[PDB]
Amino acid sequence: KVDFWPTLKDAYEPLYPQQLEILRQQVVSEGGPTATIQSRFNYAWGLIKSTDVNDERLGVKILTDIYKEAESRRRECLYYLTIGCYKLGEYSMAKRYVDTLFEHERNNKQVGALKSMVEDKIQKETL
Amino acid sequence: DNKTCFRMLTYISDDLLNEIPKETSLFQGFKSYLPIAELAIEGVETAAISSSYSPSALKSFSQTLVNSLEFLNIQKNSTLSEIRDIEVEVENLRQKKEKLLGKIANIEQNQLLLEDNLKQIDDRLDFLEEYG
Numbered sequence: 001k002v003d004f005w006p007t008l009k010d011a012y013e014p015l016y017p018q019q020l021e022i023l024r025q026q027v028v029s030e031g032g033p034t035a036t037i038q039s040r041f042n043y044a045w046g047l048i049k050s051t052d053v054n055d056e057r058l059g060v061k062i063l064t065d066i067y068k069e070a071e072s073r074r075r076e077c078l079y080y081l082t083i084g085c086y087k088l089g090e091y092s093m094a095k096r097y098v099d100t101l102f103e104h105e106r107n108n109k110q111v112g113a114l115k116s117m118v119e120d121k122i123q124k125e126t127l
Numbered sequence: 128d129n130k131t132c133f134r135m136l137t138y139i140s141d142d143l144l145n146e147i148p149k150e151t152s153l154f155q156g157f158k159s160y161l162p163i164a165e166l167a168i169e170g171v172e173t174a175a176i177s178s179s180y181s182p183s184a185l186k187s188f189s190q191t192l193v194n195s196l197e198f199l200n201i202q203k204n205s206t207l208s209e210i211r212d213i214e215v216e217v218e219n220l221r222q223k224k225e226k227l228l229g230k231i232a233n234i235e236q237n238q239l240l241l242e243d244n245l246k247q248i249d250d251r252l253d254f255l256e257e258y259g
Contacts, residue, residue, distance in 0.1 A: 003154070004152045004154065004155060005152070006157075019161060020167075024232075024240070026164070026218075036205070036209055037153075037208070038207055038209075041153050042156060045157050055194065061137050064136075064139060069212070070212045072211065073153060074142070074147065074209060075147070078143075080153075093134070096143075102190065
């Protein structure tokens, strides 16, 4: 019975390389750069969900491409990008994004959770 | 710096300031989708020995169908979303067209002035060549 918004912990457990590959194979077939937003994301997610820095970097890149392309999906993307940047440790960027996401849906419990959790890492590396 | 190159590709600015104001989520899409992706052991499920007689595995099969049925519905409106996304692109683009087509008229008449405004000085050139 899984949510509209993925938990940050969710973003931390990877996929079995089999599963990550499946997602790719699927994006391959939809046609890399012509593939559906969904299947392209769902691969990006898996990438960010992975624990290889390079995989993640694609994950963000994938997501930022999605963000560029689908105005509807932009609102959502800021959130994954925010996860993505945090996971990747480009924290400021994540504050940037999450702050944007924050205006649109301010009251969202997770948007809050994420903003808040992005911020700690901001101060704690200001120590 | 290699960490800075990548900061550079994936940068985005005016966009952030124009994010458009039940909705099935991108993430939800991803969730319902990975189970069904593990059909990879064998979006159409199995159907053959549908006729044989357990009450319980008959239902555990009914499950597979209904959680596939939820996935198709999920996959359906995600596609259906993509439709509206490119439907708005057609609008934004189509109006970018006539705005720009308005500019031909803008400079079609503004060229019409100079061609006429030229004409008068083509003309008083004849008139002054009614004299040395």
